[PDB]
Amino acid sequence: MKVILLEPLENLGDVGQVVDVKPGYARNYLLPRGLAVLATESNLKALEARIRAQAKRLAERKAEAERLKEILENLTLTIPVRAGETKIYGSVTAKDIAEALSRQHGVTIDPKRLALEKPIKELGEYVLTYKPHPEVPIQLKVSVVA
Amino acid sequence: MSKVCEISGKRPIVANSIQRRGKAKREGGVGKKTTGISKRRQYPNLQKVRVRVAGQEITFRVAASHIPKVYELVERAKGLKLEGLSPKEIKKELLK
RNA sequence: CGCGGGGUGGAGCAGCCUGGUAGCUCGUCGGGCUCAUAACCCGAAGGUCGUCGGUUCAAAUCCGGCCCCCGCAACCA
RNA sequence: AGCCGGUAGCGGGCGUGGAUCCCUGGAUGUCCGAAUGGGGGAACCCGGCCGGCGGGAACGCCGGUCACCGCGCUUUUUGCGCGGGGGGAACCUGGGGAACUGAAACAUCUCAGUACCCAGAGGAGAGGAAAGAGAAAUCGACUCCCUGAGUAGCGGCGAGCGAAAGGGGACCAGCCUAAACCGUCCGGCUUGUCCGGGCGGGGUCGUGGGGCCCUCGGACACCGAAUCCCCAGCCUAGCCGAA
RNA sequence: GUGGUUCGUGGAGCCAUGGGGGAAUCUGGGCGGACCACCGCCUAAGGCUAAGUACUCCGGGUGACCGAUAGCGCACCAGUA
RNA sequence: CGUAGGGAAACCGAGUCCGAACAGGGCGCAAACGAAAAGUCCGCGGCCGUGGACCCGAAACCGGGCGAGCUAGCCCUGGCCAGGGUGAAGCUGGGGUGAGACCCAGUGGAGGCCCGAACCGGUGGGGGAUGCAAACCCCUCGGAUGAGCUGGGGCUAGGAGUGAAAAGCUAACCGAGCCCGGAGAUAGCUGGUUCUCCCCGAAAUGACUUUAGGGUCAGCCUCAGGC
RNA sequence: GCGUAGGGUUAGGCGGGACCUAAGGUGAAGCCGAAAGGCGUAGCCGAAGGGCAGCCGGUUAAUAUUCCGGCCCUUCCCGCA
RNA sequence: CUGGUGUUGGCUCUUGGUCGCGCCUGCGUAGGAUAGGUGGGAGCCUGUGAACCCCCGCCUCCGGGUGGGGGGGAGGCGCCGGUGAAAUACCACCCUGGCGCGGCUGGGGGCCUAACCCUCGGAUGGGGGGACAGCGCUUGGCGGGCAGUUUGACUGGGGCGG
RNA sequence: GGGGCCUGACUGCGAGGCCUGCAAGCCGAGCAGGGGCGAAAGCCGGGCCUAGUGAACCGGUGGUCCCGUGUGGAAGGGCCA
Ligand SMILES: [K+]
Ligand SMILES: [K+]
Ligand SMILES: [K+]
Ligand SMILES: [K+]
Ligand SMILES: [K+]
Ligand SMILES: [K+]
Ligand SMILES: [K+]
Ligand SMILES: [K+]
Ligand SMILES: [K+]
Ligand SMILES: [K+]
Ligand SMILES: [K+]
Ligand SMILES: [K+]
Ligand SMILES: [K+]
Ligand SMILES: [K+]
Ligand SMILES: [K+]
Ligand SMILES: [K+]
Ligand SMILES: [K+]
Ligand SMILES: [K+]
Ligand SMILES: [K+]
Ligand SMILES: [K+]
Ligand SMILES: [K+]
Ligand SMILES: [K+]
Ligand SMILES: [K+]
Ligand SMILES: [K+]
Ligand SMILES: [K+]
Ligand SMILES: [K+]
Ligand SMILES: [Mg+2]
Ligand SMILES: [Mg+2]
Ligand SMILES: [Mg+2]
Ligand SMILES: [Mg+2]
Ligand SMILES: [Mg+2]
Ligand SMILES: [Mg+2]
Ligand SMILES: [Mg+2]
Ligand SMILES: [Mg+2]
Ligand SMILES: [Mg+2]
Ligand SMILES: [Mg+2]
Ligand SMILES: [Mg+2]
Ligand SMILES: [Mg+2]
Ligand SMILES: [Mg+2]
Ligand SMILES: [Mg+2]
Ligand SMILES: [Mg+2]
Ligand SMILES: [Mg+2]
Ligand SMILES: [Mg+2]
Ligand SMILES: [Mg+2]
Ligand SMILES: [Mg+2]
Ligand SMILES: [Mg+2]
Ligand SMILES: [Mg+2]
Ligand SMILES: [Mg+2]
Ligand SMILES: [Mg+2]
Ligand SMILES: [Mg+2]
Ligand SMILES: [Mg+2]
Ligand SMILES: [Mg+2]
Ligand SMILES: [Mg+2]
Ligand SMILES: [Mg+2]
Ligand SMILES: [Mg+2]
Ligand SMILES: [Mg+2]
Ligand SMILES: [Mg+2]
Ligand SMILES: [Mg+2]
Ligand SMILES: [Mg+2]
Ligand SMILES: [Mg+2]
Ligand SMILES: [Mg+2]
Ligand SMILES: [Mg+2]
Ligand SMILES: [Mg+2]
Ligand SMILES: [Mg+2]
Ligand SMILES: [Mg+2]
Ligand SMILES: [Mg+2]
Ligand SMILES: [Mg+2]
Ligand SMILES: [Mg+2]
Ligand SMILES: [Mg+2]
Ligand SMILES: [Mg+2]
Ligand SMILES: [Mg+2]
Ligand SMILES: [Mg+2]
Ligand SMILES: [Mg+2]
Ligand SMILES: [Mg+2]
Ligand SMILES: [Mg+2]
Ligand SMILES: [Mg+2]
Ligand SMILES: [Mg+2]
Ligand SMILES: [Mg+2]
Ligand SMILES: [Mg+2]
Ligand SMILES: [Mg+2]
Ligand SMILES: [Mg+2]
Ligand SMILES: [Mg+2]
Ligand SMILES: [Mg+2]
Ligand SMILES: [Mg+2]
Ligand SMILES: [Mg+2]
Ligand SMILES: [Mg+2]
Ligand SMILES: [Mg+2]
Ligand SMILES: [Mg+2]
Ligand SMILES: [Mg+2]
Ligand SMILES: [Mg+2]
Ligand SMILES: [Mg+2]
Ligand SMILES: [Mg+2]
Ligand SMILES: [Mg+2]
Ligand SMILES: [Mg+2]
Ligand SMILES: [Mg+2]
Ligand SMILES: [Mg+2]
Ligand SMILES: [Mg+2]
Ligand SMILES: [Mg+2]
Ligand SMILES: [Mg+2]
Ligand SMILES: [Mg+2]
Ligand SMILES: [Mg+2]
Ligand SMILES: [Mg+2]
Ligand SMILES: [Mg+2]
Ligand SMILES: [Mg+2]
Ligand SMILES: [Mg+2]
Ligand SMILES: [Mg+2]
Ligand SMILES: [Mg+2]
Ligand SMILES: [Mg+2]
Ligand SMILES: [Mg+2]
Ligand SMILES: [Mg+2]
Ligand SMILES: [Mg+2]
Ligand SMILES: [Mg+2]
Ligand SMILES: [Mg+2]
Ligand SMILES: [Mg+2]
Ligand SMILES: [Mg+2]
Ligand SMILES: [Mg+2]
Ligand SMILES: [Mg+2]
Ligand SMILES: [Mg+2]
Ligand SMILES: [Mg+2]
Ligand SMILES: [Mg+2]
Ligand SMILES: [Mg+2]
Ligand SMILES: [Mg+2]
Ligand SMILES: [Mg+2]
Ligand SMILES: [Mg+2]
Ligand SMILES: [Mg+2]
Ligand SMILES: [Mg+2]
Ligand SMILES: [Mg+2]
Ligand SMILES: [Mg+2]
Ligand SMILES: [Mg+2]
Ligand SMILES: [Mg+2]
């Protein structure tokens, strides 16, 4: 009695691998409680259609990111701060770095989730990382002209 | 209907109860005899299958042999209208 | 005929397990105690432990047919 | 050339401007009956609605309409639409299914799948294009007749029961579909090259056939109904017909 | 577990089928009277199909068929009194 | 059908079977001088099989229906029981006693109580017996406020019903109703069986028989053909 | 009380129906049964029970709470207050 | 009345059967003693660990066997040497019963609820029973409640007797 | 009745008859195979004789050339006992 599940069930497991069980369980507890369907050839085909429908986008969400994450480690954005010496009068945060990338090369960001705790003062040299799941490091120089 | 399967059309048949005294001739058995032969009905193993289809519950009297046929008919779902006499549709018009 | 189990002292039962005690019981004999007798205690007698043929240190304690009763449903032109 | 039934009579009428009578169609067809608006002790009783009639509101009459079921439509039927009810001498298929009797008793057996009960069909019904037969590299759908044959067998191997292949004849035709792949419409959705139900295409064979590709040049020439159409023919009244 | 077939359990196959288990799509499947091989014949699980056949309420024809106790129960207002 | 028979069969064949057998035996094979005939095919006749099989007749069996307007029970609803007699409980009054029980009067009017009509019965006797009557008449007798009788409307039935129980009753006969059907059931039994003449002319014994008053074989009668 | 023929039964109030329910019957919902069919709450059918308005006389060969005489009531419909 | 199954599910606790690998127990003086069968048989065993002690757990003809923590700082054992059939080191095959693990599994006892059943003026719901009951197929049994029949002949009638 | 070697309580048949309704029952010489006892002639196919028994069907067993449902087998039958 092969049924395709919906959620975990602890030995008779999780979100949709298939497994068969005693037929009484199925037609009185598993399908009536709306947490499985038997593996009709159509439903057996519909799942496999939606296994790749996700796993291609999963293979794509992890292709959308590492396409940008690959054309990002080739640039370098400058930050020409009114900065005096070795210390910024203002500061640079993510939102401002977004502004930098948005028009020094024309790219947008979250800007959140950028390894920026306590936005960076203090002219110098910095290399920060980014997201999604596999992620990208980015370098950027903070400089000073009027 | 009357002790019949709604899905298989299987209905009670007539068989004979045959009482036999004797050893099987295939056992050094001078012969099997027959003491009585009378009429008996064999009844299909009928059971209630109670399924909640779109609106209300739907109750079948199916031969236990054809029980999954109900749940494969439960698959077909469209026309979420009137009373518990949807089987009119779930029936032969599915299979026809 | 075929299967399950039996045949240990004059009566029966444990030893038929993992081959190295043949004993128990009542019954009969001599004896002690009781007027006594049953009782009780003591000792002694009766067993080739169903047959043969073997595996082996040894076997009643394993086997195979045998042989009788009891046991088994079954069976009948 | 007479007619107003069996049937005369009284008392009246019609017919060569073709009566009566016979054939075809049509109209009227009270009530009951599947009986169907609702009851009901068949041939009676009581209504709703729309229209009508009378002085007509009450009462009444008239015409029309209104049972239930299935099915297809559709907006869950508030409606419409077609269909079904019941009868029939025997014949027909199916679903059930005796006994006396025979066995010179009786139980297997027989009578027998008979009598009979029920459901369905029609002018026939059943059956019918091989998952067939069965020894001949063999027949070719089914039904019926004749033979095979009282053979093969079945059997308290008792009483009894009893085939088939083949052969000769009657008649003689085979056709749709589901499925793969294509289109599609609505659907549902964990939107998709997905599933799915309704329709259209396709395709139907045992030497295997089909689908999707590949090459070929294949052709409308030929085929052609069991469906519709016309016709001869026939049935439903008659007529001529020697001496 | 039974029915059907000549087959009454018989060496009992074949066609049906109430119960249980439960496939495959050509290298797949059923059958040739248990079962095995070989050699063969067939394509199951969807459906229709005239004609040749049966009967006789009805109409007509024919008779080594009756002739009013016969012939249908009824020749006559009989399924009546 | 006949022309080929023997063998359980494999088979063989004017033979084959059993058998070591060329002993044996079983069952088989064999022209009368162109006529006649094996064999078949029609027709007629005797007999048998199978069919209702010479006719009439059961007691019964089973199938499908029809019946509770009779009778039995119960359900619903109505109705009827003259008139008399006995006189329970309980009240009430009084006596009683510590308070009681209890005793006594009057009242009261209970009961499958009493005598007895209607009504329901049917004890004894007589009559009746092709009746007035397929259960009646007369005399006598039982019950008669109860388990009472009764009108109407209802339900239950054939191996079933109903039954204060007799195997009673279920439409004038119930140890299993009626009708139609299977059906011409079966009847080793009883009865019956039709013109005329002519010749022959028995037996009632034996053997076996769930047989004895039935049969099968033999015996005894008859006919045809042959010796 | 027979044959032939003619005549004879008059109802808003009497009985029953255009009221009610009882046993019982039937029966949508529903349940069951090889078929025929069997059950079944509701609803409906069902009366000698419930409900409901007519009493006395006269008349006819034959009908009268029915026709007539007198007195007396019931429902519906429509008006007004 | 009953067994096996279908309808018929969850979580557990528990045993039985078989099989395969591993581990094993078996003892009358008796080559030296407390060796299961027989075959092999000049020797092993210790390097990261040998005897004796530490205590643990198991078995006990309680003698002794045996594995684990270790103290452990290395010989412990072998046979010939027979007053027992056999010889006790060792690595195996295998019987015996046993434990364990794993596989295959049948039998039990619980608890659960969601089938199924019963209920609840109220319900795709609640309560109770509960995978039992019931019902389908099947196995065996009790079974005059009912059905179909049988229950001989001869015979100084029949019966009884014979 | 007593000894002695022996097993013919043989296999294959059986002319011819007793008896007899059938079906049975009974006696039997002789021929062939191979034997036993006897010198041999000859005897022997149980017992001095007449009772000690059961058709057929259904199976069991042991063998055997036979049949074996398309074919080789197998199932199962037949044949002798
Ligand atoms: K269910
Ligand atoms: K004319
Ligand atoms: K009307
Ligand atoms: K029939
Ligand atoms: K019978
Ligand atoms: K008879
Ligand atoms: K009889
Ligand atoms: K038959
Ligand atoms: K199509
Ligand atoms: K599609
Ligand atoms: K068969
Ligand atoms: K088949
Ligand atoms: K075939
Ligand atoms: K074939
Ligand atoms: K047809
Ligand atoms: K006459
Ligand atoms: K007549
Ligand atoms: K000869
Ligand atoms: K004859
Ligand atoms: K009866
Ligand atoms: K009658
Ligand atoms: K009722
Ligand atoms: K009334
Ligand atoms: K519930
Ligand atoms: K159960
Ligand atoms: K006498
Ligand atoms: Mg299961
Ligand atoms: Mg049975
Ligand atoms: Mg029977
Ligand atoms: Mg019978
Ligand atoms: Mg199944
Ligand atoms: Mg005139
Ligand atoms: Mg006309
Ligand atoms: Mg009129
Ligand atoms: Mg009607
Ligand atoms: Mg009507
Ligand atoms: Mg009414
Ligand atoms: Mg009007
Ligand atoms: Mg008007
Ligand atoms: Mg009208
Ligand atoms: Mg009208
Ligand atoms: Mg109409
Ligand atoms: Mg009809
Ligand atoms: Mg009808
Ligand atoms: Mg019709
Ligand atoms: Mg039939
Ligand atoms: Mg039918
Ligand atoms: Mg008879
Ligand atoms: Mg036809
Ligand atoms: Mg033949
Ligand atoms: Mg025939
Ligand atoms: Mg053809
Ligand atoms: Mg299509
Ligand atoms: Mg097409
Ligand atoms: Mg191909
Ligand atoms: Mg003329
Ligand atoms: Mg003329
Ligand atoms: Mg049969
Ligand atoms: Mg059969
Ligand atoms: Mg098969
Ligand atoms: Mg086969
Ligand atoms: Mg074959
Ligand atoms: Mg087909
Ligand atoms: Mg057809
Ligand atoms: Mg004549
Ligand atoms: Mg004449
Ligand atoms: Mg007549
Ligand atoms: Mg005359
Ligand atoms: Mg007429
Ligand atoms: Mg001869
Ligand atoms: Mg009947
Ligand atoms: Mg009555
Ligand atoms: Mg009565
Ligand atoms: Mg009175
Ligand atoms: Mg009085
Ligand atoms: Mg009185
Ligand atoms: Mg009294
Ligand atoms: Mg009295
Ligand atoms: Mg009376
Ligand atoms: Mg009486
Ligand atoms: Mg009297
Ligand atoms: Mg008298
Ligand atoms: Mg009196
Ligand atoms: Mg008195
Ligand atoms: Mg009295
Ligand atoms: Mg009373
Ligand atoms: Mg009464
Ligand atoms: Mg009545
Ligand atoms: Mg009846
Ligand atoms: Mg009857
Ligand atoms: Mg009584
Ligand atoms: Mg009577
Ligand atoms: Mg008959
Ligand atoms: Mg008769
Ligand atoms: Mg008889
Ligand atoms: Mg003479
Ligand atoms: Mg006589
Ligand atoms: Mg007789
Ligand atoms: Mg004779
Ligand atoms: Mg002569
Ligand atoms: Mg008069
Ligand atoms: Mg008169
Ligand atoms: Mg009036
Ligand atoms: Mg008036
Ligand atoms: Mg009216
Ligand atoms: Mg009424
Ligand atoms: Mg009413
Ligand atoms: Mg009813
Ligand atoms: Mg009244
Ligand atoms: Mg009134
Ligand atoms: Mg008045
Ligand atoms: Mg008056
Ligand atoms: Mg009068
Ligand atoms: Mg008046
Ligand atoms: Mg199942
Ligand atoms: Mg519980
Ligand atoms: Mg619940
Ligand atoms: Mg009995
Ligand atoms: Mg009896
Ligand atoms: Mg009988
Ligand atoms: Mg007997
Ligand atoms: Mg006698
Ligand atoms: Mg006598
Ligand atoms: Mg006697
Ligand atoms: Mg006797
Ligand atoms: Mg002779
Ligand atoms: Mg010699
Ligand atoms: Mg016999
Ligand atoms: Mg052979
Ligand atoms: Mg063969």
PDB file of C-alpha atoms (C1' of nucleotides) in Angstrom, chain B residues 40-45 47-48 50 52 55 64, chain H residues 6-8 115-117 124 134-138:
ATOM      1  CA  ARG B  40     -26.681 -23.096  -0.155  1.00  0.00           C
ATOM      2  CA  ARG B  41     -26.088 -19.482  -1.118  1.00  0.00           C
ATOM      3  CA  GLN B  42     -22.584 -18.045  -1.256  1.00  0.00           C
ATOM      4  CA  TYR B  43     -22.680 -14.428  -0.276  1.00  0.00           C
ATOM      5  CA  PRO B  44     -20.218 -11.800  -1.529  1.00  0.00           C
ATOM      6  CA  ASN B  45     -18.046 -10.398   1.235  1.00  0.00           C
ATOM      7  CA  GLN B  47     -18.465  -4.122   3.580  1.00  0.00           C
ATOM      8  CA  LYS B  48     -19.203  -0.451   4.241  1.00  0.00           C
ATOM      9  CA  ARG B  50     -17.558   5.510   4.200  1.00  0.00           C
ATOM     10  CA  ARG B  52     -15.925  12.088   2.906  1.00  0.00           C
ATOM     11  CA  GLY B  55     -19.252  18.160   0.409  1.00  0.00           C
ATOM     12  CA  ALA B  64     -14.119  -6.387   0.081  1.00  0.00           C
TER      13      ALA B  64
ATOM     14  C1'   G H   6     -11.168 -11.081   4.793  1.00  0.00           C
ATOM     15  C1'   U H   7     -13.346  -6.539   6.556  1.00  0.00           C
ATOM     16  C1'   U H   8      -8.653  -5.222  10.239  1.00  0.00           C
ATOM     17  C1'   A H 115     -12.455   1.437  11.256  1.00  0.00           C
ATOM     18  C1'   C H 116     -17.048  -1.549  12.899  1.00  0.00           C
ATOM     19  C1'   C H 117     -20.996  -1.279  16.711  1.00  0.00           C
ATOM     20  C1'   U H 124     -17.250  16.749   8.412  1.00  0.00           C
ATOM     21  C1'   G H 134     -20.609  -8.528  13.945  1.00  0.00           C
ATOM     22  C1'   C H 135     -20.840 -10.096   8.902  1.00  0.00           C
ATOM     23  C1'   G H 136     -18.168 -12.928   4.014  1.00  0.00           C
ATOM     24  C1'   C H 137     -15.576 -17.587   2.597  1.00  0.00           C
ATOM     25  C1'   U H 138     -13.634 -22.002   5.101  1.00  0.00           C
TER      26        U H 138
END
